[PDB]
Amino acid sequence: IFSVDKVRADFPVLSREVNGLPLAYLDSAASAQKPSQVIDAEAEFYRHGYAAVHRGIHTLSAQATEKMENVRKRASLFINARSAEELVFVRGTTEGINLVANSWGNSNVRAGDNIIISQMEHHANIVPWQMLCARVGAELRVIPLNPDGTLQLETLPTLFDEKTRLLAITHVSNVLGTENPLAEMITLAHQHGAKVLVDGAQAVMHHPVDVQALDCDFYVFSGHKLYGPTGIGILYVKEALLQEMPPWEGGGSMIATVSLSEGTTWTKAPWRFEAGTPNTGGIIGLGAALEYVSALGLNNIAEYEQNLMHYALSQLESVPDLTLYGPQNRLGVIAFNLGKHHAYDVGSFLDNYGIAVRTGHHCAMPLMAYYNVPAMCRASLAMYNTHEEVDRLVTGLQRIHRLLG
Amino acid sequence: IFSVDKVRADFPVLSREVNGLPLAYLDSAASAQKPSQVIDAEAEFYRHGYAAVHRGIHTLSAQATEKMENVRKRASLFINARSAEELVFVRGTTEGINLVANSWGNSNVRAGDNIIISQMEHHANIVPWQMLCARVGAELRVIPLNPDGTLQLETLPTLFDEKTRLLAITHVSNVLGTENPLAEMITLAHQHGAKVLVDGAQAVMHHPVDVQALDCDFYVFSGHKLYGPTGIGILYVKEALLQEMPPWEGGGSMIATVSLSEGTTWTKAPWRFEAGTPNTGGIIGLGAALEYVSALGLNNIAEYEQNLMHYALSQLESVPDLTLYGPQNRLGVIAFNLGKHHAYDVGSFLDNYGIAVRTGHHCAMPLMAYYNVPAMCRASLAMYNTHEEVDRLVTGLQRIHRLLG
Numbered sequence: 001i002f003s004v005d006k007v008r009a010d011f012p013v014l015s016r017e018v019n020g021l022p023l024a025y026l027d028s029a030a031s032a033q034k035p036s037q038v039i040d041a042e043a044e045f046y047r048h049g050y051a052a053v054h055r056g057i058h059t060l061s062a063q064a065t066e067k068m069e070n071v072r073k074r075a076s077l078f079i080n081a082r083s084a085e086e087l088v089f090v091r092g093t094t095e096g097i098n099l100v101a102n103s104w105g106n107s108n109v110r111a112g113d114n115i116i117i118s119q120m121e122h123h124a125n126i127v128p129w130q131m132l133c134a135r136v137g138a139e140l141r142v143i144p145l146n147p148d149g150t151l152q153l154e155t156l157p158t159l160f161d162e163k164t165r166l167l168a169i170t171h172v173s174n175v176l177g178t179e180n181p182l183a184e185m186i187t188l189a190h191q192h193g194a195k196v197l198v199d200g201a202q203a204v205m206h207h208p209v210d211v212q213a214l215d216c217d218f219y220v221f222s223g224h225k226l227y228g229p230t231g232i233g234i235l236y237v238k239e240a241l242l243q244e245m246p247p248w249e250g251g252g253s254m255i256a257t258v259s260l261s262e263g264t265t266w267t268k269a270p271w272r273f274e275a276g277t278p279n280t281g282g283i284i285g286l287g288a289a290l291e292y293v294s295a296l297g298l299n300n301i302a303e304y305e306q307n308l309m310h311y312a313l314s315q316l317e318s319v320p321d322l323t324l325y326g327p328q329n330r331l332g333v334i335a336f337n338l339g340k341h342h343a344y345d346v347g348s349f350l351d352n353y354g355i356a357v358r359t360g361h362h363c364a365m366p367l368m369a370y371y372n373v374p375a376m377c378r379a380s381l382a383m384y385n386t387h388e389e390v391d392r393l394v395t396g397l398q399r400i401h402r403l404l405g
Numbered sequence: 406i407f408s409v410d411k412v413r414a415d416f417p418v419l420s421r422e423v424n425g426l427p428l429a430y431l432d433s434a435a436s437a438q439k440p441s442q443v444i445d446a447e448a449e450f451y452r453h454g455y456a457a458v459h460r461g462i463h464t465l466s467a468q469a470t471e472k473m474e475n476v477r478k479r480a481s482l483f484i485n486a487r488s489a490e491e492l493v494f495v496r497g498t499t500e501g502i503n504l505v506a507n508s509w510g511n512s513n514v515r516a517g518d519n520i521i522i523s524q525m526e527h528h529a530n531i532v533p534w535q536m537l538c539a540r541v542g543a544e545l546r547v548i549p550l551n552p553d554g555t556l557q558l559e560t561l562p563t564l565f566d567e568k569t570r571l572l573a574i575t576h577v578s579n580v581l582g583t584e585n586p587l588a589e590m591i592t593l594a595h596q597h598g599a600k601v602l603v604d605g606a607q608a609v610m611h612h613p614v615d616v617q618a619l620d621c622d623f624y625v626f627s628g629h630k631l632y633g634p635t636g637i638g639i640l641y642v643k644e645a646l647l648q649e650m651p652p653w654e655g656g657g658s659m660i661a662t663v664s665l666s667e668g669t670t671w672t673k674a675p676w677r678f679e680a681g682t683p684n685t686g687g688i689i690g691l692g693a694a695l696e697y698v699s700a701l702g703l704n705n706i707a708e709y710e711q712n713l714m715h716y717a718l719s720q721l722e723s724v725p726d727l728t729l730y731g732p733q734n735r736l737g738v739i740a741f742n743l744g745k746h747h748a749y750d751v752g753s754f755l756d757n758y759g760i761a762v763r764t765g766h767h768c769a770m771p772l773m774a775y776y777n778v779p780a781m782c783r784a785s786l787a788m789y790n791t792h793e794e795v796d797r798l799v800t801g802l803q804r805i806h807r808l809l810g
Contacts, residue, residue, distance in 0.1 A: 012452040018464050027466070030457035031682065039451045046444045046634075047417040051761070052435035057752035058761040059423050061432070091496060091636075094656035094681025101655075123663050124681060127655035130669055142665055224682055229451075231496075231636040231684030250506075250532035251499035252768035258528050260547055260771050264535055276499025276529060277436065277629055279636030279684070347462035356456070356463040363657035366665050 002296065002304045008384045010035035010292075021354030024389040029174055029333045029380035030358050032205065032227045034289070041288030042229060042281050053280055054253055068280060071287035072270075078290050079219065080210040081236050088242075088270040089278060092233035093201040094124040096220035097168075099235060099273065100197060101128040103248045104218075105166075108195075111137030113165045116194075118143045118151055118180070119370060120173050123363040125199045129168060138165070145370050149176035149326035156188065164194045171203035175362045175378060177330030179203070182214050190215070195241070201225055205293065205382075206332050207302040211236055223282070228289030232282030235273075242269040251275035301383045305332065308381050312390045319397050325371060334379045338397065341404055343375045349403075350377075353396040355389075407701065407709045413789045415440035415697075426759030429794040434579055434738045434785035435763050437610065437632045439694070446693030447634060447686050458685055459658055473685060476692035477675075483695050484624065485615040486641050493647075493675040494683060497638035498606040499529040501625035502573075504640060504678065505602060506533040508653045509623075510571075513600075516542030518570045521599075523548045523556055523585070524775060525578050528768040530604045534573060543570070550775050554581035554731035561593065569599045576608035580767045580783060582735030584608070587619050595620070600646070606630055610698065610787075611737050612707040616641055628687070633694030637687030640678075647674040656680035706788045710737065713786050717795045724802050730776060739784045743802065746809055748780045754808075755782075758801040760794075 008014050013033045016023045025033060045067075051060030053068050069084070076084040090096040109115065115129055119142050133140050141159045144152040160167075167189040172179045186196045197218035203209055204221040211219050219236040223229060237245070247254055247266050254275040256265040266272050293301070312334065316322055321339035338346045347359035358378045361368045368375060379393060413419050418438045421428045430438060450472075456465030458473050474489070481489040495501040514520065520534055524547050538545050546564045549557040565572075572594040577584045591601045602623035608614055609626040616624050624641040628634060642650070652659055652671050659680040661670040671677050698706070717739065721727055726744035743751045752764035763783045766773045773780060784798060 013455055016453060023465075025465075027457065027461070027463065030459075030461065030466070031455075033455055034451050036452070039448055043444055043448045046439050047441070048421060050418055050436075050438055052432065052763075054435075056432070056435065057749060057764045058432065058756045060428075060430075060761065061435070091684065092681050095654065098654045098656065098680070119665070122657065123660060124656035126663060126665075127657075127660060127669055131655050140665075222682065224685075230682065230686045249500065249503045250536050251503065251529035252527065252532075255528060255532060258531060258770045259774075260524070260531075260545075264532055275503070276497050277627065277635065279496065279687070280629075281635045282684070282687070344462060351463045356465065358457075359462045365663045369664075 002300045018354045024355045024392050026379040027356045028382035031224050038288040042285035045284045071283050086239045088235040088273045090233045090235045092222035093220045096235035097128045099248050101132045103245045105132040109136050109138045109165045113163045114139040116141045116167045119145045120367050149178050160192050166195045168197045171198050171200035174202045175335045176326030177333040208298045223286045229282045229285035231279050232286045249275040315394050335376050337376050343377045349400045407705045423759045429760045429797050431784040432761045433787035436629050443693040447690035450689045476688050491644045493640040493678045495638045495640045497627035498625045501640035502533045504653050506537045508650045510537040514541050514543045514570045518568045519544040519546050521546045521572045524550045525772050554583050565597050571600045573602045576603050576605035579607045580740045581731030582738040613703045628691045634687045634690035636684050637691045654680040720799050740781050742781050748782045754805045
């Protein structure tokens with residue numbers, strides 16, 4: 001019961017033009033567009049009920065404070081967290097991982113320990129860890145890759161030992177579209193007493209996610225890629241763990257009491273990790289996005305997308321010299337290169353045709369180096385994308401071939 | 406050439422009602438309301454030209470990337486920074502101070518050094534420093550206060566020695582309304598080779614600020630209090646200093662190259678300190694706010710406000726048992742208490758009258774303890790506030806007196 005027509009109707013940005021031609025936005029993987037329900041949801045808040053949160057004595061203040069917490073609660077349901085107090089608000093996935101890397105990392109990883117990451121990880125789930133290791137004096141281990149864009153799981157036994165503190169894996173790759181066997185991996189990581197942090201910035205909007213079912217200890221995703229506003233993300237941490245974690249950022253709202261002579265005492269999670277004035281407007285907008293996606297049902301969306309993907313792939317076969325990267329059972333994104341032509345030019349011609357695509361390393365250099373490629377193209381397929389747009393890509397891609405030879 | 410009528414016309418939130426009566430929003434100090442120019446400025450961006458920044462190959466992407474940087478540039482002019490590359494985007498003042506406390510603090514303050522802060526500092530310019538001292542092993546020194554809400558400057562000579570690394574002062578208090586002699590203080594702090602970080606979250610919207618004229622090494626303010634959107638602030642750092650500072654948060658966009666075997670190299674300031682996807686929408690909105698305030702001219706606003714303040718003060722004399730806190734030459738806020746009645750109740754009755762005011766410690770406990778008061782009231786006067794609203798406060802305040810006796 002899904003209708004691309006009814007959906008695309010909510011995104012005003014889609015009826016725009018570029019270079020005089022209709023815009024074919026195939027870069028939702030970099031950041032998704034927002035429906036007018038999400039846009040107005042925030043705007044209205046600013047126009048009719050804006051006030052400082054932090055539970056104030058006056059009305060608007062107390063009302064805003066409540067709306068904010070309802071969003072936290074609603075989001076806990078979305079990923080199916082056990083309780084709303086297991087969710088911390090962050091700017092995005094990047095900040096989320098940095099919070100963990102510091103708060104939890106600095107106090108659980110001693111010199112001599114090792115952390116495991118995959119080779120397909122986005123820079124946000126790499127650098128924060130390299131830094132932790134730099135100062136704590138720990139070892140960083142990487143799960144190699146197979147040619148088809150899948151993790152070489154057979155190497156797991158020789159990476160997971162007694163001194164393995166944490167496993168930071170991506171739920172779904174942002175380039176290959178690969179979806180990793182989280183469940184299984186988490187189990188194995190737990191049998192060694194290691195914690196697991198899943199980076200689901202790419203998973204949250206392609207199908208349902210149950211943090212309880214997975215039993216991951218940390219989960220993060222960004223709102224701007226979930227058809228929502230920028231500057232707001234969600235960090236989920238198991239209550240058991242969160243309570244033990246020390247504050248990262250310090251300031252107002254996250255303290256219980258501040259004394260220049262007695263010292264300062266912190267408040268309790270999650271508020272302990274939310275210092276200063278919130279991104280109230282972004283949160284309100286995130287709620288709108290959450291509610292909107294639920295209205296269509298992740299399963300219905302998951303279906304229309306998987307269908308449009310099969311179409312897209314088969315169609316891309318008629319393009320000569322096209323080289324794809326990743327598994328056949330890919331999700332959301334398509335990584336490719338045209339013959340020996342620099343991705344920068346292929347994307348440049350495509351833009352001229354009114355088609356949006358990303359070209360570069362996609363903040364995933366280690367993965368580019370695995371393929372000896374300096375960069376590739378990445379077309380993204382989202383719920384608001386149509387078959388016609390797929391053809392438009394295929395065609396212009398063949399055109400670029402016949403032209404540049 | 407200022408007209409409260411023309412101005413209040415731009416803020417839709419002001420024509421709202423609370424408890425059936427017209428809203429008299431006197432809490433702009435906690436967070437200011439936004440004019441429809443700022444609200445739509447962001448909304449339009451989301452509707453017509455939204456895309457991921459980070460300079461992409463496609464059009465919308467490259468356009469958004471440019472708009473973002475124009476805002477950075479425009480903001481550099483607003484505080485009169487020497488160059489736009491001296492401004493880093495942050496969530497707000499709180500995050501800004503935390504960035505400095507970490508990036509600069511961890512590498513310039515050795516055990517045995519001391520940092521000086523005032524006793525009127527907001528918790529955001531206290532806790533971050535207490536933490537630095539905790540781990541680095543440095544001493545924290547406080548500039549005492551005078552009964553009239555002013556710094557006891559005579560104590561400066563005995564606080565500033567050879568081992569004084571930094572001075573973190575507030576440009577204008579958020580409770581007392583005091584404006585400190587920054588210029589002079591900065592000079593003296595520099596003669597000892599100490600750096601100065603000014604917290605102008607309360608100054609930026611009451612009158613012009615020239616970071617060059619002051620010669621401060623760090624300056625921070627939050628956009629949500631400058632009639633702008635939430636989740637976006639500005640951290641100014643002297644180019645000379647910024648270039649030397651090491652990254653705090655790690656992830657994409659802030660790297661030059663990432664190699665799992667070669668290590669990772671950073672990009673250059675300010676982008677080095679801006680990891681992950683920006684708050685593009687908040688930035689766009691910040692630009693709108695910046696441009697709007699400039700249209701009215703900080704000097705014109707500074708005048709209408711200082712005038713409304715003198716009115717307010719004289720009028721508050723007719724209120725029996727009223728106790729004010731702070732200097733006569735106060736700026737923007739009014740801290741007070743009614744007889745022996747808890748601020749919570751005074752504010753509660755005022756809310757019932759359709760008047761918004763803050764009650765509590767205002768994230769400034771050390772200051773409350775100086776007055777042996779557990780909390781006080783704080784009415785804020787902004788450009789959109791009128792004389793009538795002042796009377797409404799005075800009257801209801803006398804009413805609360807005659808009622809609770």
